[PDB]
Amino acid sequence: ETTTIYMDIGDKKRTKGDFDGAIRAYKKVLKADPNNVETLLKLGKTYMDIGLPNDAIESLKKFVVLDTTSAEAYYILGSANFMIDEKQAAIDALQRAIALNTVYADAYYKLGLVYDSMGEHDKAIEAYEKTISIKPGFIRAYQSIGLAYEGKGLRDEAVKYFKKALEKEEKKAKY
Numbered sequence: 001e002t003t004t005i006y007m008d009i010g011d012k013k014r015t016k017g018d019f020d021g022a023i024r025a026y027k028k029v030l031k032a033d034p035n036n037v038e039t040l041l042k043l044g045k046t047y048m049d050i051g052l053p054n055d056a057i058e059s060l061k062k063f064v065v066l067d068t069t070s071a072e073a074y075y076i077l078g079s080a081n082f083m084i085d086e087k088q089a090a091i092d093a094l095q096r097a098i099a100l101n102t103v104y105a106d107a108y109y110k111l112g113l114v115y116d117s118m119g120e121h122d123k124a125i126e127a128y129e130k131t132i133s134i135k136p137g138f139i140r141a142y143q144s145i146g147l148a149y150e151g152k153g154l155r156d157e158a159v160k161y162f163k164k165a166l167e168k169e170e171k172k173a174k175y
């Protein structure tokens with residue numbers, strides 16, 4: 001019961017943006033139920049929300065030990081690593097997300113962002129092209145390829161991608 005009561009109190013607080021309060025509630029669940037993976041993930045995300053990525057990483061690591069086959073958890077872990085410039089740690093976690101779900105569009109996209117940040121613009125473009133192969137409406141992937149091409153001085157190819165991103169934006173907006 002403690003687990004249900006306080007998980008529900010925490011979500012309510014997190015939803016209202018009372019992140020310190022949600023943390024207290026989630027901590028209370030984990031007192032009784034240290035292996036609660038759902039709260040480990042919520043706590044991790046909430047730590048990310050208040051700018052404490054190392055604490056996020058700790059909580060997400062605990063999750064992934066207990067449930068090793070959640071692509072989402074590895075995606076989030078990867079994102080938290082990226083926030084503290086642990087770029088290879090981000091890559092590794094995102095590659096595990098992708099291995100678990102090879103059609104995980106968001107993980108491919110983030111992987112591209114991590115490659116871009118490392119100066120690895122050709123692997124970034126590939127990661128972005130994979131993203132669009134999964135979700136052809138993933139606008140930010142067209143935009144990021146566009147900008148990768150601007151970086152390469154392929155300015156007409158960049159404009160093709162910017163126009164394609166616009167086309168997708170317009171189709172979206174008209175529904």
Ligand SMILES: [Cl-]
Binds near residue numbers: 120
């Ligand atoms: Cl590269």
